């Protein structure tokens, strides 16, 4: 792909984070802490899952960023509507305002309803995310495999401003402590 020139500098919004997440001082890395991180509750925080949003809101144009997933067992990445549900249980689907992929139990899947199997020969250490607001497109690229396409959501109905979306995943296994990191431009 040739989307690199739409690169945007994403930072994490502390105020949207689940109360167990630790966001780095530079707001470019996030990991799940071993306990509550001593923050007050607010209506923005994701309650049930270890999720956080980017600070940036997109309503037009073309945007590209990269995320490092090295040595993680489980994670979700993509974009979502600014107005997605924060509290209680919900599924990641376009009907709920999410355009995401994920890793879970050694398989990669796109957050369609129902979910779609992805065909990945080279486990990615970094993921590229491309959004074309006007075209209604969200695309995912395998940076480890020379930028090969993972998945394209097309005919997206964003229906609002978009925010970068992250889930560091559960760490029941003790094998998923590693952070998500926004990779430099
Ligand atoms: C440490 O691992 C246990 C675990 O993953 N618990 C579930 C959970 C943790 C934090 C926020 C939401 C849900």
From Swiss-Prot:
Role description: E3 ubiquitin-protein ligase whose activity is dependent on E2 enzymes, UBE2D1, UBE2D2, UBE2E1 and UBE2E2. Forms a ubiquitin ligase complex in cooperation with the E2 UBE2D2 that is used not only for the ubiquitination of USP4 and IKBKB but also for its self-ubiquitination. Component of cullin-RING-based SCF (SKP1-CUL1-F-box protein) E3 ubiquitin-protein ligase complexes such as SCF(SKP2)-like complexes. A TRIM21-containing SCF(SKP2)-like complex is shown to mediate ubiquitination of CDKN1B ('Thr-187' phosphorylated-form), thereby promoting its degradation by the proteasome.
The organism of origin for this protein: Mus musculus (Mouse)
Reported modifications of this chain: Autoubiquitinated; does not lead to its proteasomal degradation. Deubiquitinated by USP4; leading to its stabilization. Autoubiquitinated.
Cell location: Cytoplasm; Cytoplasmic vesicle, Autophagosome; Nucleus; Cytoplasm, P-body
Induction behaviour: Up-regulated by IFN.
Protein name in the entry: E3 ubiquitin-protein ligase TRIM21
Gene name tied to this protein: Trim21
Record-annotated B30.2/SPRY domain positions: 8-185
Domain notes: The coiled-coil is necessary for the cytoplasmic localization. The RING-type zinc finger is necessary for ubiquitination and for the IRF3-driven interferon beta promoter activity. Interacts with SKP2 and CUL1 in a RING finger-independent manner. The RING-type zinc finger is necessary for ubiquitination of NMI.
Similarity comment: family membership: Belongs to the TRIM/RBCC family.
Subunit note: Homotrimer. Component of a SCF(SKP2)-like complex containing CUL1, SKP1, TRIM21 and SKP2. Interacts with CALR, CUL1, FBXW11, HSPA5, IKBKB, IRF3, SKP1 and VCP. Interacts with SKP2; the interaction with SKP2 does not depend on an intact F-box domain. Interacts (via N-terminus and C-terminus) with DCP2 (via N-terminus and C-terminus). Interacts (via C-terminus) with IRF8 (via C-terminus). Interacts with ULK1, BECN1 and with ATG8 family members, including GABARAP, GABARAPL1, GABARAPL2 and MAP1LC3C/LC3C. Interacts with TRIM21 and SQSTM1/sequestosome 1. Interacts with IRF3.
Full protein segment contained here: 291 to 468 of 470
Source species, domain of life: Eukaryota
């Amino acid at each position: 792909h040739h989307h690199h020139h739409h690169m945007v500098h994403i930072t994490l919004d502390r105020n949207t984070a689940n109360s167990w997440l630790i966001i780095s001082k530079d707001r470019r890395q996030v990991r799940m802490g071993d306990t509550h991180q001593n923050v007050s509750d607010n209506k923005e925080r994701f309650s049930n899952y270890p999720m956080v949003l980017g600070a940036q809101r997109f309503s037009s144009g073309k945007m590209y960023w990269e995320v490092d997933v090295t040595q993680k067992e489980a994670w979700d990445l993509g974009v979502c509507r600014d107005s997605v549900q924060r509290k209680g249980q919900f599924s990641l689907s376009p009907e709920n305002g999410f355009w995401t992929i994920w890793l879970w139990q050694d398989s990669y899947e796109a957050g369609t309803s129902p979910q779609t199997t992805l065909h990945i020969q080279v486990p990615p250490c970094q993921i590229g995310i491309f959004v074309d607001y006007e075209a209604g497109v969200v695309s995912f690229y395998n940076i480890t495999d020379h930028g090969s396409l993972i998945y394209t959501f097309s005919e997206c109905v964003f229906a609002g401003p978009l925010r970068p979306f992250f889930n560091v995943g559960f760490n029941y296994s003790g094998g998923n402590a590693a952070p998500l990191k926004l990779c430099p431009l």
